[PDB]
């Protein structure tokens, strides 16, 4: 234990157990899960309350109009790294006057968290992040890690109890590339169902939607237009 | 000053004036305007003198050391190469005219010109000075391609030998480099 | 007993900033209340000795004169919040001839929530409740020393905030009125408080669209005590 | 780096400093050496030693000239010495650029033990380990102080430091006297170095070097072995 | 013994001692190799085997023969990172002397920078002391062969033929009570003495292959690399 | 323990367990190994599915630094990344000052080196990462070269990494290497790297393949992988 | 590992144990017997323990990856009445950084799980359930997540 205690310190099995935190720390988070058509990407986030009154606190977030991201984890590095991204989109958008392809995009991420990774005195980044939007050739769906691992998937779910949710991806992930959004969100949310105790879902409170498509600028749902998406589901059985 | 520079088969060739002024006065009769940079590698240099001699120091630095690790000859191209980042860095405080040659292994003798303005140029021959405005006539129906070092040597005493006779700024002897694969061979005339 | 400041729990969390919530407990409550009608806010003195001036303690601190601001936890920590949080809605108008949103100044605000470190201190000690009317009707957040910002209809902090929120749920709905709230909540003070409730111990701020600005001189305090 | 900047040395419970006072050890555990000034200059002396026959004996040298009326030798480990030497040349060299004309000898013991006390108060270093002994004759008198780790400088008509400089210490207190000249100091200086020297002690097994009013000058083994006709 | 973090940083012992420094010449013997140099009248030579486990390993890239100058070559051991950052650093204040100075450097004032560089390596308190050793030879004017060992501690020394590795001692041994009794050494001399002290130190009958061989001479001052055909030349030269 | 913390103390013996563990920490990984015939050189790697995990196709480890500059990386991933954004803004300075390809010599000695700079330090640790390095050329051939976690790096025929690593090298030297041809040694590896990791340990694996030499011009690409696809038809004909 | 070791302890110690190093390996060999040994740490032994005749074979062992995880509760998972809607590799997945004695364990307390409701087969929440027991949840109020 002794020798966990810092990033730069090693381990005699050789697994630096301070990332290994970090990706404690993702797990804390509510749920949320992405994936993406042939033609479109849609990820919906799981919103928590702190109590009553208080509000849900918020998970999707608009970066471009053809960027957008999830969250889980900590608040500080995601406001933090958010506005590196925001900085780091307009950036190419003053420059080559284009819009950033999302993989080198995603590369940047991964160099802008090496460092203090390695560097004496310097946390790691606690955060589940999701992104999904248009290069020239379609959708694509990656997630993050305090490792700063990018991976190129076709859907995942990350946070509270996303073992479950993965397993309802691949048992219809053939149908994940021929339907459209409307039986593809509902798709999507299908999974997020199972990560809930068995007495509430999605009463029009706790629920969001990006979506980014063909002619579609990404845009975010909230409770209210939501609605009309949370119409058609059956119940869960048992 | 003038300087004069022409490859052939075998390797290259070199030769300049020994001259230096400054205002309406002669400075020096006889002067180096030749460079022995490495083995297989001359630079003739005209324009400012302390340019010009700080500047050769500098590559002369460099690229010694850069062989040195390299473990293997240098590259006339590669040395070229260096006196285009200096001179185009500090374009707006240097008045050089350096021309750079030499022979190499990898592929025989080179010839590359390098302008005060910081550009960077192979030829068959180039030619640099003051004076050097005074034989472009001579030296372009002179010239006739493939012709062997001594005719090189000939040609080129011709040409610096016209040159210093109708400028009043070049003059002093006639120094003159030949550069192959077995060495470098050096010497002075007259006439 | 001496660990990296900047390091996360084995289990993951934390090591200080767990401590520093852990601070806001010991710190004096707060109650605000958001209203259709407006905002209120009420919190306790916890005056000491008599010799003591009382109205030299405050923890109602305007921001801008829409923007009424409550603390609770290491003061002197929370008045250079105060002060940024004054000068960058400055910047705001002087910069743009409007008002900065209440949500958007606190997102400026907890910014620096969370940026000690060695290059380029610690972390805060303090919690605070933001009020203020805006182009979407009266506003009320809530932050804490993680940055951690959230929206809430009528939160209560401090060292008996767990009963405050709790009655409070019993009691609060969402079609209140402005005095309704103001009592209900001062109701909850003297239920949470020990000393009694006078014209010195606690203290309100009170935020409307017409009655633009917060407005809490005294013996309105005791015609609302006399009310109750 | 990083900046760390904290000094390793406090003080001690008891109001000492303990890294100071071990590096006073590594010097008492040096070469034994000794200097001695008599009414005409300085004599340096040293006991060099090599390890084996293979070493070179040109190639390493201890008696180190600074100025040409300025002499140093040291007691301690080897290379720390070189460092802090060329320290000491510079540092001559700037006052000479400053007034032209050679430095006093007092003021190098006052610059140098002001490096070296700074150096022991700075951070993240350890003192040197190392004490040294100057001498020159500056103005007619020949001057003659010592250092220390600690910093600190004394000025002494004779004394010795490595290994024993206490039995040799006693014994320049009762062989030396208040005035002599430079060649009974010599012979004296070779005695206590004989006092705790290897058997055969030829040329190459010390080396001496001295001030004179003329200047400062180093001996050769021809004169040393040339010297070494009436041992001790 | 231990006190407080002697053990563990650049500080002197109660005894007056740090013990990091002597961890560290014993890290060069994990090199498992052992160097042999020697000077002779107008020549000086180096040679040291070398270990090739692997068929798949190249030949030519496992030389610790490192030409520094034109006229200064180098040996190196302990671990072949550090040799390796060794190496551009006795290059680049190589170079720097000529750019400063005109003339070429001295191969005893390079072996002063390096040992003075290896200074602070073990002066400052947060820096590892690059566990590795240094051996130099070359040629001077007015002066003929050199050869300097330049050592993680930061001190060098003359001599006149000096091994190193991981057989010092024997090696020493060997050639104390070979070199002192009035040799004359000539080129042949000297090398056929190289060979035979290390092959007797490791009882080996090489191959012309493992070996290798540095020289330089007073008639051409190029240092100079040999080939395993002369080097096999001069195997069977003491091959009687 | 209690000397395994820094990787600026030396253990009383002579050695750092920094490095000591860093080294095994990348033995963990999957196999990576990489040959090279007599006009050009071949990379395979093993990498693994565990159920379906992503978009096959994602995060090969088979970079590419220069247009005839090959990665073979191995142990961590992310470092991995790292250093070969180091690789490409090296070449990238050396073709900006110089105007040419940047040998592998001096492309990995630098790599080399600013390895070696994080073993020096409390402030930093060591890497978790190998890798191999592929290069062509009509006027120098083949060269590849292999670097370690500590700083050690040189040339090979060939040569493996990760955990089948001893027992992968065996059958390795098994095959002539040099008058074959990269295209018979493509399908070669594939009965390599598919007699290695089974059943009872790991999942259905992944064998991707990177390809640079005479073929390919001096361009490094990876192979035509789903083309011809002699790898498997010539990775399984050795069921008995 | 020996040293320099002071009045007592050690000073038996090293003693029988140089008797099991001798009547072990060495004078007087026997092929009549074979020794198995087992341990946790392995860097306090001597070398003439673990030289190569005295101790031939060395085996270490890993923690189940991902099917051991998986497999072993679905052993311990034998004799107990499952509902046969459950998946071992769900449970392998969501079981992190366990071993053999655990994964035991949280089988183990599954089955008590649902005897305090008194059902008869499991459930995967059963499993979670127990997999948190086994975790040693701390506390609340971690909500400032997300």
Known sequence: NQYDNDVTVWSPQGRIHQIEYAMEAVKQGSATVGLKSKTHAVLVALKRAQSELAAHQKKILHVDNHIGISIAGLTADARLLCNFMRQECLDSRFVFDRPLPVSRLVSLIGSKTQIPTQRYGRRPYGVGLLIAGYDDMGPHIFQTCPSANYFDCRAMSIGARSQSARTYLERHMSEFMECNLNELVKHGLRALRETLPAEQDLTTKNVSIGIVGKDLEFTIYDDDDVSPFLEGLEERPQ | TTIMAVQFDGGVVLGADSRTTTGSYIANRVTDKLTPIHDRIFCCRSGSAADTQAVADAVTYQLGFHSIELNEPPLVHTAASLFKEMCYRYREDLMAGIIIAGWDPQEGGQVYSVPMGGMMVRQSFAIGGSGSSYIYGYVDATYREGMTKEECLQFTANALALAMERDGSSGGVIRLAAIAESGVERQVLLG | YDRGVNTFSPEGRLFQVEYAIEAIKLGSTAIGIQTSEGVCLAVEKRITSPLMEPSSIEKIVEIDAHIGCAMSGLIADAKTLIDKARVETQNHWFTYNETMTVESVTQAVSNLALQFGEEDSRPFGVALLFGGVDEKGPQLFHMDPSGTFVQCDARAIGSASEGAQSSLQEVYHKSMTLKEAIKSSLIILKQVMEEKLNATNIELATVQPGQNFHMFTKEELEEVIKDI | ?232 | ?240 | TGYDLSASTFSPDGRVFQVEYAMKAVENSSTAIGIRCKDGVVFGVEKLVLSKLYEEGSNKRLFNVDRHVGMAVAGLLADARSLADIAREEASNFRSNFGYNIPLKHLADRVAMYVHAYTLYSAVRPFGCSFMLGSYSVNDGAQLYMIDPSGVSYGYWGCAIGKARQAAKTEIEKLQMKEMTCRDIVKEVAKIIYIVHDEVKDKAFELELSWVGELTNGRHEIVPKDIREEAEKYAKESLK | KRFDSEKAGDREVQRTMLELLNQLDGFQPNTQVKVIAATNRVDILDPALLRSGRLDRKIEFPMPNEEARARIMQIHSRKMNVSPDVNYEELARCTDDFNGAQCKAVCVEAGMIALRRGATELTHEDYMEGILEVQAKKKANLQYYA
């Not at chain 4, 070189?82 to 007092?106: D, F, G, N, S």
């Not at chain 5, 002066?123 to 050793?133: I, S, T």
């Open chain 4, 1 to 232: 780096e990083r900046g760390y900047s904290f000094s390793l040395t406090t003080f001690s419970p008891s109001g000492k400093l303990v890294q100071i006072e071990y590096a006073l050890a590594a010097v008492a555990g040096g070469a034994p050496s000794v200097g001695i000034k008599a009414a005409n200059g300085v004599v340096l002396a040293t006991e060099k030693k090599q390890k084996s026959i293979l070493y070179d004996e040109r190639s390493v040298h201890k008696v180190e000239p600074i100025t040409k009326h300025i002499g140093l030798v040291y007691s301690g480990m080897g290379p720390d010495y070189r460092v802090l030497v060329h320290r000491a040349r510079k540092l001559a060299q700037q006052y000479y650029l400053v007034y032209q004309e050679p430095i006093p000898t007092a003021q190098l013991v006052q610059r140098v033990a002001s490096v070296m006390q700074e150096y022991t108060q700075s951070g993240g270093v350890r003192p040197f380990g190392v004490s040294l002994l100057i001498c020159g004759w500056n103005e007619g008198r020949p001057y003659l102080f010592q250092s220390d780790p600690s910093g600190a400088y004394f000025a002494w008509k004779a004394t010795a430091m490595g290994k024993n400089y206490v039995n040799g210490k006693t014994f320049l207190e009762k062989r030396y006297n208040e005035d002599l000249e430079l060649e009974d100091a010599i012979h004296t200086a070779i005695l206590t170095l004989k006092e705790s020297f290897e058997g055969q002690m030829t040329e190459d097994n010390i080396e001496v070097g001295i001030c004179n009013e003329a200047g400062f000058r180093r001996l050769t083994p021809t004169e040393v072995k040339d010297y070494l006709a009436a041992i001790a």
């Open chain 5, 1 to 240: 013994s231990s006190a407080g973090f002697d053990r563990h940083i650049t500080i002197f012992s109660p005894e007056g001692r740090l013990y990091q420094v002597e961890y560290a010449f014993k890290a060069i013997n994990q090199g498992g190799l052992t160097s042999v140099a020697v000077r002779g009248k107008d020549c000086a030579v180096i040679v040291t085997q070398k270990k090739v486990p692997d068929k798949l390993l190249d030949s030519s890239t496992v030389t610790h023969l490192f030409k520094i100058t034109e006229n200064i070559g180098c040996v190196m051991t302990g671990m072949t990172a550090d040799s390796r950052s060794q190496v551009q650093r006795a290059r680049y204040e190589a170079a720097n002397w000529k750019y400063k100075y005109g003339y070429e450097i001295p191969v005893d004032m390079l072996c002063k920078r390096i040992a003075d560089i290896s200074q602070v390596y073990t002066q400052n308190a947060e820096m590892r002391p690059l566990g590795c050793c240094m051996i130099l030879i070359g040629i001077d004017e007015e002066q003929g062969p050199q050869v300097y060992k330049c050592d993680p501690a930061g001190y060098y020394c003359g001599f006149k033929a000096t091994a190193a590795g991981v057989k010092q001692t024997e090696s020493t041994s060997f050639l104390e009570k070979k070199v002192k009794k009035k040799f004359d050494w000539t080129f042949e001399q000297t090398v056929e003495t190289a060979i035979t002290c290390l092959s007797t130190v490791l009882s080996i009958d090489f191959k012309p292959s493992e070996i290798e061989v540095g020289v330089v001479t007073v008639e051409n001052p190029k240092f100079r690399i040999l080939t395993e055909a002369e080097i096999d030349a001069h195997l069977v030269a003491l091959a009687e």
